[PDB]
Task: inverse folding
RNA sequence: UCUAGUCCGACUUUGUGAAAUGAC
């Protein structure tokens, strides 16, 4: 994201102007919660447990069927982006569970 | 204007100019563009070649502002300079006027025609054709690019 | 109709631009893809209610097809297509007359 | 601050704790009529974020609605028309089950104003919602600046004009820009505006 | 070219067990 070259074509084209960083906004921390919210969600996970399909994912990760675990996650959740995020969450749960 | 309408001249002539045999019926050849391939085939092929069929690539949500590029030719470049500035151009040959076509709502400079004789001009534009640049240079001028 | 297995014909490839040896094989129409835009539109049009939404040809008249020879150049390994006249019996590399 | 715990627990609907509680509640609701007054919301945390307040004038009703599509209500499944319109099943109502629950409560409770509603349970045959209604005539409501707007005549039968939260969803108003632009100010208003033939004086 | 109905399968309603057999 270099300053514009002043030419109408090519890389970094555009009118020459002094660029500046946008002023910080409260919405910049969207997607971040307080420490209490993380504490509450962690506690409820202990009380509630895991869903049946999440149990299926972790069972596949124990036998090392990582590829099949992701396909199950995508079929359930729907998107590849959410599926691979869910698989990493199950791996993290299993990773620190086998170490206890 | 009703009094000039030719139907008035046809009052008392029975058929109103549409004939006794053929008559004036409702839609004896179909409505609008009906039968373009069947009974109006000759008309379409003779007067509208290329009407039927598909050509080229689609462009979903095509915005015309992205393609905005008004052009000005070499022969019209001198007319942009104010008359009072034209006299100054002929009064001092050491300097040359700077014609920024963008200030007059033009992006690209094309090369149709010729420049005034013995008058160098510095042309400022976003884009320029090779012939336009050659004609500007051979007249003693220069080209500057902007955006 | 009998056609030889090999044929020496002109090659349009910029590498050759000359007469070269070609291997003769018969063209066969490939499988229709489900992802082709025309198929995608047809499936959308056919969905829901309304029944058959496109014509279905029924009055077949031709008893033959225009066989297309697939000529693969042996130099540049490129293919050219050469249709022949209609025929009911066609083969490539069959026994020549007399022999 | 206890509502976050309750709300997060209700996000785990497939857990053993919730599956048990929902299973028992689903049986209980089936035995009762399709519209029932409840002494207090089953989901206080969910209710108060939709505008519910624990004060006189606010009432909660549970509404039961049948599930599935909309069979075309035509005798013997016979349609007199072209094949494109001959479908009878696999047709879907343009309004949602949540909207239907609000309309059922609104029509029955003509003396109250529908504020909002929320999902509480479902089975294969029925879907259950709780509808929050306001007694606009109660003094506690009329003296409350945050809710007394609903006492004005323009807000009569919000649910029957598609003006509730569920109403905005099925009208296409939850969203804007290139994907929702035809829904504002209304779908039929957009059509009439675009169909208008403007014949100016000097044309 | 379609359709009510009807037959059929899957998912859902739908939980608690056991055995046989099979897969990972
Ligand atoms: K006439
Ligand atoms: K259709
Ligand atoms: K009809
Ligand atoms: K039609
Ligand atoms: Mg006459
Ligand atoms: Mg007549
Ligand atoms: Mg005629
Ligand atoms: Mg006419
Ligand atoms: Mg569809
Ligand atoms: Mg269908
Ligand atoms: Mg009370
Ligand atoms: Mg507009
Ligand atoms: Zn070749």
Result:
């Amino acid at each position: 994201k270099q300053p514009n070259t002043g030419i109408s074509v090519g890389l970094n084209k555009g009118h020459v102007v002094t660029k500046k960083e946008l002023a910080p906004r409260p919405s910049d921390r969207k997607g971040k919660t307080s420490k209490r919210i993380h504490f509450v969600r962690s506690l409820i996970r202990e009380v509630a447990g895991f869903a049946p399909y999440e149990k299926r994912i972790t069972e596949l990760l124990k036998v090392g069927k990582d590829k099949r675990a992701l396909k199950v996650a995508k079929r359930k959740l729907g998107t590849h982006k959410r599926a691979k995020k869910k698989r990493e969450e199950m791996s993290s749960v299993l990773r620190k569970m086998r170490a206890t | 204007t009703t009094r000039f309408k030719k139907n008035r001249k046809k009052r008392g002539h029975v058929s109103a100019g549409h004939g006794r045999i053929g008559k004036h019926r409702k839609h004896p050849g179909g409505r609008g563009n009906a039968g373009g391939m069947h009974h109006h085939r000759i008309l379409f092929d003779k007067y509208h070649p290329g009407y039927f069929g598909k050509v080229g690539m689609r462009y979903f949500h095509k915005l015309r502002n992205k393609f905005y590029c008004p052009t000005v030719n070499i022969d019209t470049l001198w007319s942009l300079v104010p008359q009072e500035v034209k006299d100054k151009a002929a009064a001092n040959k050491g300097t040359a006027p700077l014609i920024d076509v963008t200030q007059f709502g033009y992006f690209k400079v094309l090369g149709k025609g010729v420049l005034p004789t013995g008058q160098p001009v510095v042309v400022k534009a976003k884009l320029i054709s090779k012939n336009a640049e050659k004609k500007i240079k051979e007249n003693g001028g220069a080209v500057v690019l902007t955006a | 109709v009998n056609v030889p297995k090999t044929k020496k014909t002109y090659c349009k490839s910029k590498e050759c631009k000359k007469h070269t040896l070609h291997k003769v094989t018969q063209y066969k129409k490939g499988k229709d893809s489900l992802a082709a835009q025309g198929k995608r539109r047809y499936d959308r049009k056919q969905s829901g209610y309304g029944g058959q939404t496109k014509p279905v040809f029924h009055k077949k008249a031709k008893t033959t097809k225009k066989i297309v020879l697939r000529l693969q150049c042996q130099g540049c390994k490129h293919v050219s297509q050469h249709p022949i006249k209609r025929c009911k019996h066609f083969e490539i590399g069959g026994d020549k007359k007399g022999k | 601050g206890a509502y976050t715990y309750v709300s997060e627990l209700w996000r785990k609907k497939q857990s053993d704790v919730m599956r048990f509680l929902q299973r028992v509640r689903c049986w209980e609701y089936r035995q009762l009529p399709s519209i029932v007054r409840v002494t207090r919301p089953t989901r206080p945390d969910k209710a108060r974020r939709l505008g519910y307040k624990a004060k006189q004038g606010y009432v909660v009703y549970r509404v039961r609605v049948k599930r599935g599509g909309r069979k075309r209500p035509v005798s013997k499944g016979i349609v007199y028309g072209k094949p494109t319109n001959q479908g009878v099943t696999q047709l879907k109502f343009q309004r949602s089950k949540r909207s239907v629950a609000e309309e059922r409560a609104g029509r029955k409770l003509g003396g109250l104003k529908v504020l909002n509603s929320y999902w509480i349970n479902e089975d294969s045959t029925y879907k259950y919602f709780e509808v929050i209604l306001v007694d606009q005539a109660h003094a506690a409501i009329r003296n409350d600046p945050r809710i007394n707007w609903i006492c004005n005549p323009v807000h009569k039968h919000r649910e029957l004009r598609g003006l509730t939260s569920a109403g905005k969803k099925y009208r296409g108003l939850r969203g804007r820009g290139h994907l929702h632009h035809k829904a504002r100010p209304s779908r039929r208003a957009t059509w009439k505006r675009n169909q208008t033939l403007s014949l100016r004086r000097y044309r």
